Amino acid sequence: SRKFFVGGNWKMNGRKKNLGELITTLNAAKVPADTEVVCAPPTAYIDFARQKLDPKIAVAAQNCYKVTNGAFTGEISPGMIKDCGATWVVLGHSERRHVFGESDELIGQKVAHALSEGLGVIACIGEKLDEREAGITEKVVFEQTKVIADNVKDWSKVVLAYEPVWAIGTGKTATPQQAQEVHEKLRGWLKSNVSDAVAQSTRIIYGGSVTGATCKELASQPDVDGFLVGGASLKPEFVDIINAKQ
Amino acid sequence: PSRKFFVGGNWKMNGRKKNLGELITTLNAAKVPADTEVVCAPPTAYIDFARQKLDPKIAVAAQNCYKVTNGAFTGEISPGMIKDCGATWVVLGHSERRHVFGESDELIGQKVAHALSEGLGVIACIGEKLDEREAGITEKVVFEQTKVIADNVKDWSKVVLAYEPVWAIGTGKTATPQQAQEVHEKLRGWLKSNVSDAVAQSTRIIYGGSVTGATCKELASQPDVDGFLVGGASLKPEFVDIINAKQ
């Protein structure tokens, strides 16, 4: 079976003081046997985070570029991430897609480069509200994953995150059933476009709004393998989410 | 009270902890002239690391930042975060962010206002591309760019302007010292008549074109060139010579 995966995306939040406290809280928490825990601190703090965090928890970067070195001021490479002791990178997040307008082609190139360099990838997909209301969720998510799939050689270091963009700051919450329906179709796509083994072993995590209160019902869905957590990553609520499957 | 000579080294997306520690040991040994301000800009992952190993005589800058203090912008960093790591400068509006990542003038201006309001120094980059120089419209482009920046600066004492001759980077088209001078002079003239005399006489305008240990002396001798924003040469000992360009 698939190891339960819990990622905490800190986004653009925190200073050395309040993050050190957050880290002390996590260091105390007991991590269940079959649970994989990953934190993604702001880029300035990757180094700081890895030095203070217990080796039991992984560190991810929130983004990177697609070559190993070069004239791209303000960017960082997978090699730099590895160099700081991080092992994962989040690629293709909704915020890079829809705020900063990163293209599918570019996300794919980033995926292939980060994997070639030994990093794990959390690859984000999902549809916006205008597209859900038109009835084209399926078309939009599959097209996204084809572009990722076309660039993955070895699926053992890949995690797919579904982000229901249509239900973030819209005043429109997604039900557990609605998450489940999309996770099932994604797994089905992997089954018929890649292979059975890849479909059965690849973890698909839900990156929608999750709280200490909602997490239990979402984690009991058959095709939900864990979480990519936004705002709750910064509170002790995170420790409850880590224990969601018990 | 003439303008302090300003030398910035932009490391861009280069280096690991090993070869940067060595580069840092080299700089730490170098003697910095009395009237010279030295700034290094390490990749974002290494701002912290850089500040801890570098002598307090050298400033650290970030290569970029966003326009609010905290929020849902994954992969971004705020001026508050930069301050927090012991850096005092940020490079905003570099050609690479403008032309590779398509950051707009409106966005660069918003970043400039936020970074200044938070106590940071700003190196603000401007410059025209080749298609635009060949049309004869250098003046129109750089001006219109500087205007967006000026509209967002309250206090010019913490601002440095860098001219990037984009038309002569990977074009096979080197700029002469005289061609640099002619653009620096017009920019200073713009400041004089659109802001003030005091601002024009005291603001440093640095050249962000291709500079080597071999070219730096002739460029530093130009009346309206106040120093450098160095690209590739920042990673070699050639940088120490450039620091001493005015000597």
Swiss-Prot record, chain A:
Q: What is its EC number?
A: 5.3.1.1, 4.2.3.3
Listed under GO biological process in this entry are: canonical glycolysis; gluconeogenesis; glyceraldehyde-3-phosphate biosynthetic process; glycerol catabolic process; methylglyoxal biosynthetic process
Modified-residue entries (N6-succinyllysine), positions: 146, 153, 191
Give the sites of the cross-link named Glycyl lysine isopeptide (Lys-Gly) (interchain with G-Cter in SUMO1).
139
Question: A cellular component term (GO) from this record?
Answer: cytosol
Residue list for modification Phosphothreonine: 170, 211
Where would you say this protein principally sits, based on its record?
A: cytoplasm
Q: Give the modified residues of type 3'-nitrotyrosine.
A: 65, 206
Q: Which residues carry this modification: N6-methyllysine?
A: 191
- Entry annotation: catalytic residues: 93 (electrophile), 163 (proton acceptor)
* Classification via InterPro entries: Aldolase_TIM (IPR013785), TIM_sf (IPR035990), TrioseP_Isoase_bac/euk (IPR022896), Triosephosphate_isomerase (IPR000652), Triosephosphate_isomerase_AS (IPR020861)
Which Pfam family, an example, fits this chain?
TIM
Q: Where does substrate bind?
A: 9, 11
Superkingdom of origin: Eukaryota
Where N6-acetyllysine occurs along the chain? 11, 153, 191, 235
Can you name one GO molecular function term for this protein?
Answer: methylglyoxal synthase activity
Query: Per the similarity annotation, which family is this?
Result: Belongs to the triosephosphate isomerase family.
This one is known as Triosephosphate isomerase
Q: Give the organism, scientific name.
A: Oryctolagus cuniculus (Rabbit)
The major lineage groups are: Eukaryota, Metazoa, Chordata, Craniata, Vertebrata
